[PDB]
Amino acid sequence: MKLPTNLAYERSIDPSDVCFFVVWPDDRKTPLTYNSRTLLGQMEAASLAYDVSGQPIKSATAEALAQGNPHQVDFCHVPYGASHIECSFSVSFSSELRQPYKCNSSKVKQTLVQLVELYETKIGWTELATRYLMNICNGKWLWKNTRKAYCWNIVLTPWPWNGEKVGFEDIRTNYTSRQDFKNNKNWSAIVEMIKTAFSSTDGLAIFEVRATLHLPTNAMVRPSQVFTEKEQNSRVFQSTTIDGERSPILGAFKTGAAIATIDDWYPEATEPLRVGRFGVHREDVTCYRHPSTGKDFFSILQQAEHYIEVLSANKTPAQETINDMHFLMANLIKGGMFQHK
Amino acid sequence: MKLPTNLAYERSIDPSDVCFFVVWPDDRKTPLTYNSRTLLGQMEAASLAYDVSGQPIKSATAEALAQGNPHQVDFCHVPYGASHIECSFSVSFSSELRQPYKCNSSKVKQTLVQLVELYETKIGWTELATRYLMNICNGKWLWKNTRKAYCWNIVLTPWPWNGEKVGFEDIRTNYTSRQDFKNNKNWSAIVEMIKTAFSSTDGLAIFEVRATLHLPTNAMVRPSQVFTEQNSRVFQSTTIDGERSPILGAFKTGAAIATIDDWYPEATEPLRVGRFGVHREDVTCYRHPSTGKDFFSILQQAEHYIEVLSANKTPAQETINDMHFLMANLIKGGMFQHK
Amino acid sequence: TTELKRAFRPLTPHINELDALTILVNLTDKAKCKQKLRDEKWWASCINCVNYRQSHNPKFPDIRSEGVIRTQALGELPSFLLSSSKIPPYHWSYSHDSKYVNKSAFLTNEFISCLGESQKTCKAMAKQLADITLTTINVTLAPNYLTQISLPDSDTSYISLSPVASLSMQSHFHQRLQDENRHSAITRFSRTTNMGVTAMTCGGAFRMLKSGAKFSSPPHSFLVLPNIRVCGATALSSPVTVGIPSLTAFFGFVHAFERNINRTTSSFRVESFAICVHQLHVEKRGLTAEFVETISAPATRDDWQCDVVFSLILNTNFIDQDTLVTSLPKRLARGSAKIAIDDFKHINSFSTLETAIESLPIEAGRWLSLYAQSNNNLSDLLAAMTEDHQLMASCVGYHLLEEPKDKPNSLRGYKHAIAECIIGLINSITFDPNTIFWSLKNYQNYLVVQPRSI
Fold first, then answer.
1. Which residues, 6+ apart, have CB-to-CB distance to B64 below 8 Å?
2. Rounded CA gap, C142 and C140, in Å?
3. DSSP 8-state class, residue B306
4. Subunits with at least 3 CB pairs below 8 A relative to chain C?
5. C171: closest CA among C19, C10, C55, C327?
6. Residue C439: φ, ψ to 5°
């Protein structure tokens, strides 16, 4: 199947900023604040004592290399008498998945709607909605703040819901595997919301998520930080205004990248990757699903007509060639321009 | 081995700021405060009496040189009727050593991972974890406040722990050598936390440290102070309740836990662990690149250290002190790039 | 020699005829005898450069886009609006090439006219005369990187628009804001030589217009939409100002809400709307673009983002809670727009203006009317800005360069035109009603979201 010169979808999952609050004993809440402070380190860079070729530079003597190097950073910590930290945001599940936002080929637009409706019937939205919801319900969207904590608790508040808010107490002890989420009293009632949202022509499914982090005394928090061009401050946090004060946030695009770490179907899969075209890893600067493999997202769009005859049969669809179906769907939930240029 | 264009680790030890409190008799606690006050000193500079060359400047007569030079400093002291001083912070030990945080080379990543596994299996985490923990358990992180004191007492509260808080009473008398720490009722149980933290893919080990300083009457306390590029001494501070209060910073505290490096080629005093290990008392670098024992010359011998640790022969002290310095800079972290 | 090079470049005011032309030949090299050399090949390279001289730069935010625009704004807008027609159109520059940014200096430096407008001289004039071709537009909407905007033209009809940054305006706001450090907001763009000659002058720093001081709030049939907390919006309302998002984006939020209800109730048809802003907070958050195909990230740009919290009141033509919630549009100028579940109670509909404004919570705010007083210049804008610091310039509408025609690819099958941003000043009312309620007016020459009184 050819790719059109206009094809782009909207995203189906819409997060927000993560705001940080400080809870004092006697239960009053204050927005978390931060300050900048200059520090003094040594003169370690390996560019300050060595040249490009590898030999030691002669200007960097032993006295000149023990001199002291000042740097300015933003520093955010938990106040002394505090009890814990609230962390609140909210997700929607829109189902802009069913139709393209933009298309100029009637043959390709019909091929989408056959793929979405045949994936929905034969395979169903149970597998993907389980994987997204196991990133909300643990502290995946709390990136580094989960690490080095006593315990953290997640409390959901869904909108098309009757009552009795959904709780997830003491992760790192209770909720380790897939089975521990399913043993919750109301887990299938929430998985079947995201299935209801994706499968309807107008599905909404608001969640209101709120965490409770019990840190050590006087401990660090790690918010997200800015990306700017260079013409002294080496670490600048992203922030909002809560009440009348500045406050560190953990951004909306940073939060959406944590819900979408699902992709463990690249050809040598160990760790799940963030869902995207030719799915990259930013830990080690490489590209799994490189287009030479043939398992990036544009080489599966050219097999999209072929995946209709597989789903329209009655034989069991042979797990290797439906891991490509999960990756095909997760990029249309993610959205994006799908042209060549 | 070559240095890649991306190589960076996270730190495996995460301290916090130290908060100072005043304990009164009847055992109520108030945060310590400070004030700025102007003083008046003499006019000593050697730039005011002599020129650059060495002859005396002639505009500085005996009347102009006895005139009075005002300054302004921050001044913190213990209140009068106080009992002692509490100092509390927290340390974590969180296994960032096992794999590099960011590394674009898959060959250099495999080599670094083998070293951390070969080192624990052949040498073990007993030597480093003892040296880090002995800087918590005495007053190393209380830098100059330990000096000129009556006694100081450390109380640990480890987190994956059952009960009976670990106490170290009357340092400068009871805890002087390595054997004095080993004779504590529970020292092996706390060393084996830091060993378990470094040896696991998710090792956590949180400590809650609290000290008790008995100073003389109305005595000085020495907090950490700011770097500014008027007040000549400006303290670092945090807000406790509604009071400004002196702290002893998070990076200052981590510099005291990592004074371990006494393997530099003429070692007398242990140094703060870093690349080309500096000694800022006498402003020089031991472990200069001309020595061949800085950290970037021990990285390029990492493939060599794998055949040494995977043999049955006892490794020599000279080339396992290079392995302690190799491991102590990965616990410290940092960017290890080039070019 | 740098002060001589900056003078012929378009971000400085203009400046013996035998001295000047010998400079312009030496600028094309990467002396008076280098000028006397006359390579035949050199002439046809400079002839291409006067072809790709441009009035308005399509490749401003994105350097991968491709187009040539040498037009003037069509028609003249009133005194309370501002666009490229009022400022004299002569600070035009060169684009499309990175190798020929030096070789364009002979025929495009425009010492006010431009040189681009024995045997070789006759031949050179013939190529220039035949290849001047005044007032051209060369865009292909199929495989490039443009923005596309549908606006409700007239009624039951739409026109696609593509905004393009105007080079005469960018020089005007850059030169005037050298003095004022309070009202300038520097944004840096990478790969400067690929952008154009007008970026190579400033080095990448473009010196936008920042709205005075920080936002503060004094305590100040109809449908009420309260508390639309938007997380990451564009503060870039224009290619010129950084602050609250363009009022066309607030109009798109309302009209997509109008268009979603017409699936169920097909007679809804919002007439006007009113905006009650709380809490701006404009910041320089970045934006990490994804990897593109040899796989890397594209060129980086300074990103200005804002966090608007506001209550929207709409004057309906004449509805269930489940219909009002699911028909809410989920974006306001690229930002996640949401209402809390505890604020779903306050989506009631009222019949009077007094009961609606007493109904909403978060009392301190502003009500956003337009400032209609004679801003024909940035010096006219900044005179209003220094009197009242919270006066908040933004983009108010679009100003066409050419009448809409049929293109082979336009966003959703409509007539396409190329427009430019119109900058207006935005007041605030303590709270009569026609000053507050905004609506989209359609004129042949331009499109502006005006209040109903103006």
1. none
2. 6
3. H
4. A
5. C10
6. -155, 160
How many CA atoms lie less than 13 Å away from B100 in the CB half-sphere? 26
Helix, strand, or coil here: A103?
A: strand
In angstroms, rounded to a whole number, what is the distance separating the alpha carbons of residues A25 and A22?
Answer: 10
- Can you tell me the distance from the alpha carbon of A46 to that of B4, in angstroms, rounded to the nearest whole number? 12
Q: Which residues of B touch A218 (CB under 8 A)?
A: 16-17, 19, 88-90
Experiment used for this model: cryo-EM
Q: Which candidate, C184, B90, C439, places its Cα nearest to that of A220? A: B90
**Is the Cα dihedral A179, A185, A186, A188 positive or negative?**
positive
| C-alpha radius of gyration, chain A, whole number | 24
Contact between C439 and C272 under an 8 Å Cβ cutoff? The reply is yes
A26 close to A257: Cβ distance less than 8 angstroms:
no
CB C313 within 8 A of CB C224: yes
Chain A nearest CA to C143, separation (Å) = 6
Q: For residue C10, give Cα distances in angstroms to A12, C114, C170.
A: 45, 12, 10
In angstroms, the separation between the Cα of residue B91 and the nearest Cα of chain A is 9
Nearest to A208 among C281, C290, C341 (CB): C341
Cβ of A81 within 8 Å of Cβ of B241? The answer is yes
Listed residue (A19, A170, A21, A222) closest to B14, CA to CA: A222
The 3-state secondary structure of chain C, one letter per residue: CHHHHHHCCCCCCCCCHHHHHHHHHHCCCCCCCCCCCCCHHHHHHHHHHHHCEECEECCCCCCCCCCEECCCCCCCCCCCCCCCCCCCCCCCEECCCCCCCCCCCCCCCCCCCCCCCCHHHHHHHHHHHHHHCCCCEECCCCCCCCCCEEECCCCCCCEEEEECEEHHHHHHHHHHCCCCCCCEECCEECCHHHHCHHHHCCCCECCEEECCCCCCCCCCCEEEECCCEECCEECECCCCEECCCCHHHHHHHHHHHHHHHCCCCCCCCCCEEEEEEECCCEECCCCCCCCECCCECCCCECCCEECCEEEEEEECCCCCHHHHHHCCCCECCCCEEECCHHHHHHCCEECCHHHHHHHCCCCCCECCCEECCCCCCHHHHHHHHHHCCCCCCEEEEEEECCCCECCCCCCCCCEEEEEEEEEEEECCCCCCHHHCCEEEEECCCEEEEEECCC
